[PDB]
């Protein structure tokens, strides 16, 4: 009975930025879902296409956990069939998505008096991101006709934008840690299963 490393994903000292979200593939372990839905710590728990109680009985070939920190307003954006700047250019969720998105407030952990600007999000991108696609390239965005030529200038802007993340910031602006669980049964063998 080797439990799946859920605690490592959820209780992680460092979480990746929105633009370069961290994906962890979990398999070949007895996953315990009871702890996730029996804990009141998580502010927001949404499950699409699956039921948390039913998860224990169900067997899945692979589980994908996506970890990123976003603003409170942006939590709404990351959902199937939802349009937002974060959804369009940072993290995209398929409309036909089976899994649970879990968000909890991390204001104390990720806010400092100066403000935590390490976290970044892709303000500008040429096209909307396809589902489950990560763009990490840092290339100056071109908006005007004139070519940027790799140099910051008028009508040319660096894509990444810092998050203020002050401690006194309002709940909407407070940092929120989000873990997205994706359940895939496409592979013929089933490994994770449940307890």
């Amino acid at each position, epitope marked *: 009975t080797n439990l799946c490393p859920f605690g490592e994903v959820f209780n992680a000292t460092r979480f990746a930025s929105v633009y370069a979200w961290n994906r962890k593939r979990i398999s070949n372990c007895v996953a315990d879902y009871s702890v996730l839905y029996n804990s009141a710590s998580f502010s927001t728990f949404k499950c699409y296409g699956v039921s948390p109680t039913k998860l224990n009985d169900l067997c899945f070939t692979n589980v994908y956990a996506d970890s990123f920190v976003i603003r409170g307003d942006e*939590v709404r954006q990351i959902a199937p069939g939802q349009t937002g700047k974060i959804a369009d250019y940072n993290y995209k969720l398929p409309d036909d998505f089976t899994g649970c998105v879990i968000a909890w407030n991390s204001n104390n952990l990720d806010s400092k008096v100066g403000g935590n600007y390490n976290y970044l999000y892709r303000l500008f991108r040429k096209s909307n991101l396809k589902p489950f696609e990560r763009d990490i390239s840092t290339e100056i965005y071109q908006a005007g006709s004139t070519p940027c030529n790799g140099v910051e200038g008028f009508n040319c802007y660096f894509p990444l934008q810092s998050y203020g993340f002050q401690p006194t910031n309002g709940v909407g602006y407070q940092p929120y840690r989000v873990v997205v669980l994706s359940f895939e049964l496409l592979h013929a063998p089933a490994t994770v299963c449940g307890p």
Partner: nanobody
Amino acid sequence: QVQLVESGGGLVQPGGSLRLSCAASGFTLDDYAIGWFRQAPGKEREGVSFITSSDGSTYYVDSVKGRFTISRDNAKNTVYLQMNSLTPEDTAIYYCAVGPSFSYTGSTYYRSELPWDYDYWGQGTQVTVSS
């Protein structure tokens, strides 16, 4: 059009029991996920009790757990929040949120403590508990 009408509320003694009813019109109550929200003066709305699933499963925040019970009546198309053992710290404006429809989306369990997540809002009703 979706219209929400809130009923109940008023001055209550500490430890009093009060029932809040949110009227639902223009939509089916069962399909949507209903979350009650509490707004303190000068503060963002905070979710207290939610209808997580269409089956009627409910989640209560630790602060309001046990004391607050949320019930849904299909026949009257009204969702009732029952508050017991009320305390002065519970003096705030209370809101009901229509939320996303379970049938339209793929959601089976939906709960959020953030106001933006919920699709629709209703006018607030003030509840005051003062010794």
